[PDB]
Ligand binder design. Structure first.
Ligand code: 19T
Ligand code: MG
Ligand code: NA
Ligand code: ZN
Length: 345
């Protein structure tokens, strides 16, 4: 069971049936959690690494891998409504699918692939369930440590890398020095690019890149160098981090409930401290359906449209689902600055 899934489970057969969808956008990670004793991140990372032969390629012990992943998953907070191990697992599995998009076939090195999925796994570790801006506004120790810049993203990185230095946790021991160095650099790059306040400038740079794209006669992207590759990978991970609205409505709605609960819990903190309640964080004046439509139309669609343009035609299904979900939320609205502000500056 451990050998098969990297986790103990009372229903191996149900877990195995769900993991049949490992390479699919339609994987249901909530079910994976339910059949893995709420170890979705360890489970999904083990599955992904076996699928891609990454433990063989990089000589990573499977036991050491399970040990690291368990401590990493333990460092996600169960009582944080959205930014917990289920979201990390989702981003990792979503990154895993995006890496296999036909337009990117054989484009990336194995180390690049390793770096993207590892980054996905660690990108929100030890999230406190309050935003960067909250941490800045409350004079937090983390904001003081990190000089107000990508405060949590720097913290997620430091925690993720520090766990590797625990006894029996160094999954990269068998990499060469040069490999370790390159991997570190790439992971730092990608996790720092998940700072939502970089969304606009990241999208601008991606469009610029997409203007210059060239493909083979088979539709495969031609990337000139490292610089172009890591740019696609940053953006890939960002897209995986804003993929909830591109999943089935059933899944999207569960994600939305969770991020609203998280925001509302921060707004209750802010209220208790006599602070102005941040946009999206006031449960008494929230308009959830309307905000999702604006989120999609101004942030998530523009990003996915640029991504879809890059990997044309691979991502049309994703765009169609996103539109369809937008239509649903729009139909459920009962009879702009706060939005856009979390995604720029
Ligand atoms: C993908 C889940 C998701 C959904 C479904 N909706 C929204 C927002 C809707 C309206 C809005 Cl303003 S944010 N944000 C989401 N994620 C998210 C996560 C973190 C942050 C950083 C921050 O707190 O500033 C911003 C957005
Ligand atoms: Mg984050
Ligand atoms: Na935990
Ligand atoms: Zn995230």
């Amino acid at each position: 069971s451990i050998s098969r899934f990297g986790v103990n489970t009372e229903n191996e057969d149900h877990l195995a049936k769900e993991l049949e969808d490992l390479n699919k956008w339609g994987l249901n990670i909530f079910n994976v959690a339910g059949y893995s004793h709420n170890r979705p991140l360890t489970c999904i990372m083990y599955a992904i690494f076996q699928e891609r032969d990454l433990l063989k390629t990089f000589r990573i012990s499977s036991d050491t891998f399970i040990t690291y992943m368990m401590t990493l998953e333990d460092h996600y907070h169960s009582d944080v409504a959205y930014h917990n191990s289920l979201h990390a697992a989702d981003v990792a599995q979503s990154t895993h699918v995006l890496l296999s998009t036909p337009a990117l076939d054989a484009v990336f090195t194995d180390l690049e692939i390793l770096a993207a999925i590892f980054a996905a796994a660690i990108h929100d570790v030890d999230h406190p369930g309050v935003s960067n801006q909250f941490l800045i506004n409350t004079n937090s120790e983390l904001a003081l440590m990190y000089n107000d810049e990508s405060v949590l993203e720097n913290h997620h990185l430091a925690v993720g890398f520090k766990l590797l230095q625990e006894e029996h946790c160094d999954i990269f021991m068998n990499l060469t020095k040069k490999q370790r160095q390159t991997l570190r650099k790439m992971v730092i790059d990608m996790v720092l690019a998940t700072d939502m306040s970089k969304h606009m400038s990241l999208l601008a740079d991606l469009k610029t890149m997409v203007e210059t794209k060239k493909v083979t006669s088979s539709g495969v992207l031609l990337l000139d160098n490292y610089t172009d590759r890591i740019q696609v990978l940053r953006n890939m991970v960002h897209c995986a981090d804003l993929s909830n609205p591109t999943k089935s409505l059933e899944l999207y709605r569960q994600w939305t409930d969770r991020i609203m609960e998280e925001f509302f819990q921060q707004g209750d903190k802010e209220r208790e401290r006599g602070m102005e309640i941040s946009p999206m964080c006031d449960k008494h004046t929230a308009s959830v359906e309307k905000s999702q439509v604006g989120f999609i139309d101004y942030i998530v669609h523009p990003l996915w449209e640029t991504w879809a343009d890059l990997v044309q035609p691979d991502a049309q299904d994703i765009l169609d689902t996103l539109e369809d979900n937008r239509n649903w939320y729009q139909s459920m609205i009962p009879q702009c600055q706060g939005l856009m502000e979390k995604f720029q500056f």
